[PDB]
Structure formats: structure tokens, C-alpha cells
């Protein structure tokens, strides 16, 4: 009576634990991947992150400048 009224079967806890373990394992591998990606991006600078600003080339004046040799 106690088992029927207050508790459930072992399969419920078993599968819940499996789902939780899978979720946490994916989270851990994602954290490692994010750390590695951050390290590589900061070391190289070829990714969208750590793109420090540079001088815009649209500000340059392309016209004769009173002197042929610029």
C-alpha cells in the first residue's frame, strides 16, 4: 500500500538519472569547447570575438592634394 500510494517504480528514477547525466555531460563538453574556442580566438584573432577596432578606410581622401607626390 505504501509503495502504491506514495512511491513509484525504479525505472522512473533510472531514466531520470540517465537524462540528467546526459544533460550534464553535454554541458561539460560544451564548457571545455567554449574555453578552447576562446583561447584560440584570443591567441589568433581570426574569429568574431576579440575584434579590436581599427581605423576606417572610408575617411581617407582620394583626391589631388596640391602636390603630385601626396
Amino acid at each position: 500500500w505504501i509503495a502504491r500510494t506514495f512511491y513509484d517504480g525504479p525505472e522512473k528514477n533510472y531514466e531520470k538519472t540517465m537524462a540528467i547525466l546526459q544533460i550534464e555531460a553535454e554541458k561539460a563538453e560544451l564548457r571545455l569547447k567554449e574555453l578552447e574556442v576562446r583561447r584560440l580566438m584570443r591567441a589568433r584573432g581570426d574569429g568574431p570575438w576579440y575584434q579590436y577596432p581599427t581605423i576606417d578606410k572610408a575617411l581617407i581622401d582620394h583626391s589631388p592634394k596640391t602636390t603630385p607626390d601626396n
Binding site: 603630385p68 607626390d69 601626396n70
Partner: protein, 57 residues
């Protein structure tokens, strides 16, 4: 890095104009009216090449 090339003195020899600034100013308008084509060609070459060594002729 690299060697700067410079034309020899024989390439820079030419019959200079030995008149003063006042003489040039007196005929400046007529000089510009008459000698416009070679001067404009030289000026265009000067602003296009951006190199004095490319406009001696």
C-alpha cells in the same frame, strides 16, 4: 631594403629658362594660353605617376 634608382646627370641636362620672376609674370597669361597643351600633359603625368623620375621627357 632595395636600391633607389636615380637618372644620371646626362638625363637631366636641358636648355634652362634664364629669365627672372618678373619676366615670367609679365607674359604669364599669354604663356598659359599658348603653351597649355604640353604643360597640362606634364601636369597630368605628374599627378598620375606620383614619381618625378617618370616625367623627365
Amino acid at each position: 631594403p632595395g636600391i633607389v634608382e636615380l637618372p644620371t646627370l646626362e638625363d637631366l641636362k636641358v636648355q634652362e629658362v634664364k629669365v627672372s620672376s618678373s619676366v615670367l609674370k609679365a607674359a604669364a597669361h599669354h604663356y598659359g594660353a599658348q603653351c597649355d597643351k604640353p604643360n597640362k600633359e606634364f601636369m597630368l603625368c605628374r599627378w598620375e605617376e606620383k614619381d618625378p623620375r617618370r616625367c623627365l621627357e
